[PDB]
PDB file of C-alpha atoms and ligand atoms in Angstrom:
ATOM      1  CA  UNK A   1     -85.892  -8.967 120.115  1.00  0.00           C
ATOM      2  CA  UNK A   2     -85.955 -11.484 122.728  1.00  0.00           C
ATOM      3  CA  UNK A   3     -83.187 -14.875 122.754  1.00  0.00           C
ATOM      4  CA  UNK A   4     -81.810 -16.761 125.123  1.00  0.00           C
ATOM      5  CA  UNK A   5     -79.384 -14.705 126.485  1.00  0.00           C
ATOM      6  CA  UNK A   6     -81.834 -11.661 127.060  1.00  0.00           C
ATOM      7  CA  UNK A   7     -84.202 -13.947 128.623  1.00  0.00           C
ATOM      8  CA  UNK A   8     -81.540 -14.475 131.296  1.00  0.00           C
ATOM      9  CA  UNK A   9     -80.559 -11.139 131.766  1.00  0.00           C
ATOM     10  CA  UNK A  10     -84.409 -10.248 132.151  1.00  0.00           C
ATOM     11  CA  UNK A  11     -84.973 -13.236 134.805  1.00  0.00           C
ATOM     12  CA  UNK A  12     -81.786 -12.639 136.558  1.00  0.00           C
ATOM     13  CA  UNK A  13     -83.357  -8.499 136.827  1.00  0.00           C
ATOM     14  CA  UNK A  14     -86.445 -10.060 138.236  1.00  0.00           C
ATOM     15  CA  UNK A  15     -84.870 -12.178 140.700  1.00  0.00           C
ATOM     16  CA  UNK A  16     -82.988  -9.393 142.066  1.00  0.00           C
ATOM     17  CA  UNK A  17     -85.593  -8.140 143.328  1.00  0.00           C
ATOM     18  CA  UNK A  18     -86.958  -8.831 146.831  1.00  0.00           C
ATOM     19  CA  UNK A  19     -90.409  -9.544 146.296  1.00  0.00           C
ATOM     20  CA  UNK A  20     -90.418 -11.310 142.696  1.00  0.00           C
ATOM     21  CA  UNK A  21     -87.869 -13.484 144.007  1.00  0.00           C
ATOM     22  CA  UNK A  22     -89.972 -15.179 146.314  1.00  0.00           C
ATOM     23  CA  UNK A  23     -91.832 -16.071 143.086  1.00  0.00           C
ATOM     24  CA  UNK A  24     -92.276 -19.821 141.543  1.00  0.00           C
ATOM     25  CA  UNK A  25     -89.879 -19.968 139.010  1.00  0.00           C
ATOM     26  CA  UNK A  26     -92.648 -20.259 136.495  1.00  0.00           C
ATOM     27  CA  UNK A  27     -94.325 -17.199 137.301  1.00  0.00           C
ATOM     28  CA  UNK A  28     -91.046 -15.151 137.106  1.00  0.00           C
ATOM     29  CA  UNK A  29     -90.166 -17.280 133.605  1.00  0.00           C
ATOM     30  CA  UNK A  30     -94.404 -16.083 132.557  1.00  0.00           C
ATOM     31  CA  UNK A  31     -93.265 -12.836 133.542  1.00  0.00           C
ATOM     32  CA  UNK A  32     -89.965 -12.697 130.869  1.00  0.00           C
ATOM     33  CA  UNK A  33     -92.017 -14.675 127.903  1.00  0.00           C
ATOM     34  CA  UNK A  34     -94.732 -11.613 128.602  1.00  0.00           C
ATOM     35  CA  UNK A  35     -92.467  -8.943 128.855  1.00  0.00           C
ATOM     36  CA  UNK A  36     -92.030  -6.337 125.662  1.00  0.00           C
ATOM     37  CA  UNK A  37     -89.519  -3.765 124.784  1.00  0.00           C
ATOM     38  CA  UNK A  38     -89.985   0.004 125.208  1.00  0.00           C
ATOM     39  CA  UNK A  39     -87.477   2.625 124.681  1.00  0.00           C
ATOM     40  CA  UNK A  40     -87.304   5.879 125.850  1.00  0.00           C
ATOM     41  CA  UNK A  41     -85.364   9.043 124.389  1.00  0.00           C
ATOM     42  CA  UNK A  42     -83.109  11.341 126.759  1.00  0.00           C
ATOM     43  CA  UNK A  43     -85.100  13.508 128.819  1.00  0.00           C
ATOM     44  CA  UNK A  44     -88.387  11.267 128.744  1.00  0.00           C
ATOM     45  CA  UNK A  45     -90.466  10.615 131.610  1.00  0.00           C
ATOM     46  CA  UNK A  46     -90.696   7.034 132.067  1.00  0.00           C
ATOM     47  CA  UNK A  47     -92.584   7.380 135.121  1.00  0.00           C
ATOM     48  CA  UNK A  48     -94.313  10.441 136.769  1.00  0.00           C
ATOM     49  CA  UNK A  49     -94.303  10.794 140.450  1.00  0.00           C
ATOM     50  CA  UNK A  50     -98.226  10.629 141.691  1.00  0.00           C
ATOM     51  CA  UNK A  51     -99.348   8.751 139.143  1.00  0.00           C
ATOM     52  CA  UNK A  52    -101.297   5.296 138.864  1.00  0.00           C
ATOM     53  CA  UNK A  53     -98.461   2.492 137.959  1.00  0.00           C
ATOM     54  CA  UNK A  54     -98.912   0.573 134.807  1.00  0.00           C
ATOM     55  CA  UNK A  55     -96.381  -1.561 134.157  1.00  0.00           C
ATOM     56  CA  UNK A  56     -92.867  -3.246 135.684  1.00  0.00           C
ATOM     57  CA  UNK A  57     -89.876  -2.758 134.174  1.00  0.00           C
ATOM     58  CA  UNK A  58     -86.403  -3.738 134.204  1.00  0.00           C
ATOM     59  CA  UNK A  59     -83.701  -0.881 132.808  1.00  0.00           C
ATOM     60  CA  UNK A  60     -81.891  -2.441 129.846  1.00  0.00           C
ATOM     61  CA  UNK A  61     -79.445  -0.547 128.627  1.00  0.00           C
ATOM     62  CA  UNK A  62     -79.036   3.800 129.657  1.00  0.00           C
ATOM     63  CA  UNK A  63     -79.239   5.955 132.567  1.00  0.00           C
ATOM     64  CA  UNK A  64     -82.195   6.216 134.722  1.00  0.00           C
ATOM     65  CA  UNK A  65     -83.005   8.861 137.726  1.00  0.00           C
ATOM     66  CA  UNK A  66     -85.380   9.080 140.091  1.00  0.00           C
ATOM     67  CA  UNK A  67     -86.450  11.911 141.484  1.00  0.00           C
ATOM     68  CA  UNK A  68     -88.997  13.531 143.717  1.00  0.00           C
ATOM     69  CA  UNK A  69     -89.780  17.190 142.850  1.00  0.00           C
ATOM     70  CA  UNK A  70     -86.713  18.775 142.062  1.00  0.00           C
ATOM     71  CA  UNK A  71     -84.692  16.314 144.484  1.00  0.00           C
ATOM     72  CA  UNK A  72     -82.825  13.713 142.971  1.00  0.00           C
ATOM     73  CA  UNK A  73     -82.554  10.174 145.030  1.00  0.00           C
ATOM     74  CA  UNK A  74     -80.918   7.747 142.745  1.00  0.00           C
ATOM     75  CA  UNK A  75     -79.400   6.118 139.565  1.00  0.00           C
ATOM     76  CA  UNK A  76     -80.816   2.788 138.807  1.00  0.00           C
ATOM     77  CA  UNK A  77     -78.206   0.150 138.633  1.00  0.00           C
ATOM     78  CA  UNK A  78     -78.121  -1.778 134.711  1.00  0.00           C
ATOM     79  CA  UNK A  79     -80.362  -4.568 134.404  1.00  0.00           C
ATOM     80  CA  UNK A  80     -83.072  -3.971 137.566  1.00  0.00           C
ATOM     81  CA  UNK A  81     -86.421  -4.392 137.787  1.00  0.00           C
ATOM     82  CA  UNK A  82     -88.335  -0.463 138.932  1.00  0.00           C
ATOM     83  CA  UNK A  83     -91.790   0.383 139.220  1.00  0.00           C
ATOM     84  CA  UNK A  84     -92.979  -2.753 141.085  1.00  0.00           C
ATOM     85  CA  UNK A  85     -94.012  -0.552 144.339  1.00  0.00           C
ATOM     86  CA  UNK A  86     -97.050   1.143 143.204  1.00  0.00           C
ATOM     87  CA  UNK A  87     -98.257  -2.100 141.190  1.00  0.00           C
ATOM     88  CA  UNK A  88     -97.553  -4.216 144.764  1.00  0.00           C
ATOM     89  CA  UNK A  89     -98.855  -1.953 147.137  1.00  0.00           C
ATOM     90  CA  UNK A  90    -101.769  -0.109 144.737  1.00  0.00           C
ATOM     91  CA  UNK A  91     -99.986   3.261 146.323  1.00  0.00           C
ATOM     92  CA  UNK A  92     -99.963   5.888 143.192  1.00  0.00           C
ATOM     93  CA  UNK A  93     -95.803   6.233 142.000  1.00  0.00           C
ATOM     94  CA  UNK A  94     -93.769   7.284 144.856  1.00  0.00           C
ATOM     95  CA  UNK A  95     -91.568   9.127 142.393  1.00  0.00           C
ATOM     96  CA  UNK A  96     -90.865  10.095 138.977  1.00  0.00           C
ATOM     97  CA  UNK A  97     -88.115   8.105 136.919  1.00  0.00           C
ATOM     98  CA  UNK A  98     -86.505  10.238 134.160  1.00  0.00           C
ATOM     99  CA  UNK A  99     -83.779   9.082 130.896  1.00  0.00           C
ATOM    100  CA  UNK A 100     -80.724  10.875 131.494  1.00  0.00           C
ATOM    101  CA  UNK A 101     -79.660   8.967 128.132  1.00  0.00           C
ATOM    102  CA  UNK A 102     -81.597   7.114 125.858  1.00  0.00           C
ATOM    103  CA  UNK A 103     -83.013   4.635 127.496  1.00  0.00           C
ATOM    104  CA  UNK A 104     -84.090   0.906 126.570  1.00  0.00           C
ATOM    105  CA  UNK A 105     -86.251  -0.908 128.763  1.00  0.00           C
ATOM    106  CA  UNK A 106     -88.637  -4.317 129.314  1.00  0.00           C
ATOM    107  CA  UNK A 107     -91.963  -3.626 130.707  1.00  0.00           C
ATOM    108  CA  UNK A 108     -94.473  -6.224 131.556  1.00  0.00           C
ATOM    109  CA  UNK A 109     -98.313  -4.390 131.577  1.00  0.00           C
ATOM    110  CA  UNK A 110     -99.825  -4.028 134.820  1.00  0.00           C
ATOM    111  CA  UNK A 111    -102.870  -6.463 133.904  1.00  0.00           C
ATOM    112  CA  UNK A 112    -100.446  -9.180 132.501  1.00  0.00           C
ATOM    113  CA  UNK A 113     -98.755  -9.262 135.564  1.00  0.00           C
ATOM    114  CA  UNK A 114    -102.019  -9.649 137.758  1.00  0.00           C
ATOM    115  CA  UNK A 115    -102.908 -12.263 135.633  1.00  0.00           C
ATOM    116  CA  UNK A 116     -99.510 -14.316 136.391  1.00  0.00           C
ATOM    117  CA  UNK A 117     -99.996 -12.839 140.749  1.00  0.00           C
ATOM    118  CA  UNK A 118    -102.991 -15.136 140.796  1.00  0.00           C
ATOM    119  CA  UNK A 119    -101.455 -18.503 139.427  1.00  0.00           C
ATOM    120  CA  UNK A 120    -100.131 -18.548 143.145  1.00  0.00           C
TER     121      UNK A 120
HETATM  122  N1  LIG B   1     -89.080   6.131 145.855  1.00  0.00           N
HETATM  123  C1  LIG B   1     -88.006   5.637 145.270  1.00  0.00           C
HETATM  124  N2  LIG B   1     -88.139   4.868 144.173  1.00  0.00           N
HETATM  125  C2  LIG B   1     -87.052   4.373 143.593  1.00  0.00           C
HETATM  126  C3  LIG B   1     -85.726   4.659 144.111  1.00  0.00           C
HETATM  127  N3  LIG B   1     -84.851   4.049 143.332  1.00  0.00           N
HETATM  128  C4  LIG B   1     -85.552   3.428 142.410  1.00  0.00           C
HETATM  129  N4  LIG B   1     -86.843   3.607 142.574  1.00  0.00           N
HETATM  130  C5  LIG B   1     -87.926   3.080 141.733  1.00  0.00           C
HETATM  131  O1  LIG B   1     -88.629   4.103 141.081  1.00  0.00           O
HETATM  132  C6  LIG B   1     -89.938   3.690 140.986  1.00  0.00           C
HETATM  133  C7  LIG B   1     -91.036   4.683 140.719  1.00  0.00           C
HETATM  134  O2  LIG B   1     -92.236   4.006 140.638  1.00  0.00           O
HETATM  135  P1  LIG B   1     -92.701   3.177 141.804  1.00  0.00           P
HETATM  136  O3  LIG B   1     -92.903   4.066 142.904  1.00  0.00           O
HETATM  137  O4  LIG B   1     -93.817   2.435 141.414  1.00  0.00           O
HETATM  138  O5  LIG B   1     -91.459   2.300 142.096  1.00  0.00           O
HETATM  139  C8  LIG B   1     -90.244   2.985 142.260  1.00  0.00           C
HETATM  140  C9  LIG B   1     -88.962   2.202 142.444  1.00  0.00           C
HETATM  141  O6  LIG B   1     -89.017   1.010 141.740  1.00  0.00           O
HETATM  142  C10 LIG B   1     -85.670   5.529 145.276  1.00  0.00           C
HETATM  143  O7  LIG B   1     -84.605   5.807 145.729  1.00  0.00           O
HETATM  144  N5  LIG B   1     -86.816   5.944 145.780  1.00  0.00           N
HETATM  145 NA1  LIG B   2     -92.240  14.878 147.011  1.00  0.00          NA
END
């Protein structure tokens, strides 16, 4: 369910960020077109601490935490782009990332986004 204006909220997400904004343009406009939705329901993992990443996302709409253990760190701000670090740096997750509501999300798969890395 991707127009227009949700491509711009997607590729504004991405440019947020410090790394994919040193991106061509075209790669972070691949990146949207590739993107797909996934929702998550309140108390879901959407990512476990320890684990390989997957996939990027950027938080759409509901409350994300991250946590580490039984510590929690942080609230991810609406319309950000989370789990780049352990697809950038091939580290396993650094920490788990929990729906406090339900949760909607974008997530681009792991391979996809290799794929568009090496067009640079
Ligand atoms: N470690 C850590 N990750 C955070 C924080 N806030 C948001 N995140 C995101 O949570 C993600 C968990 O998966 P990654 O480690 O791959 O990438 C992490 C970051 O994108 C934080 O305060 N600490
Ligand atoms: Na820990």
């Amino acid at each position: 369910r991707k127009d227009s204006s949700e491509k711009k909220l997607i590729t504004d997400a991405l440019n947020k960020n410090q790394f994919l904004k040193r991106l061509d343009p075209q790669q972070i406009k691949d990146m949207v077109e590739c993107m797909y939705g996934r929702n998550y329901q309140q108390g879901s993992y959407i990512i476990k601490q320890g684990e390989p990443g997957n996939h990027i996302f950027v938080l759409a709409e509901g409350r994300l935490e991250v946590f580490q253990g039984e510590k929690l760190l942080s609230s991810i701000p609406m319309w950000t782009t989370f789990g780049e670090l352990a697809i950038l740096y091939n580290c396993t997750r650094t920490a788990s990332v929990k729906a406090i509501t339900n949760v909607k999300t974008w997530a681009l798969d792991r391979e996809v986004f290799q794929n568009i890395m090496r067009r640079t």
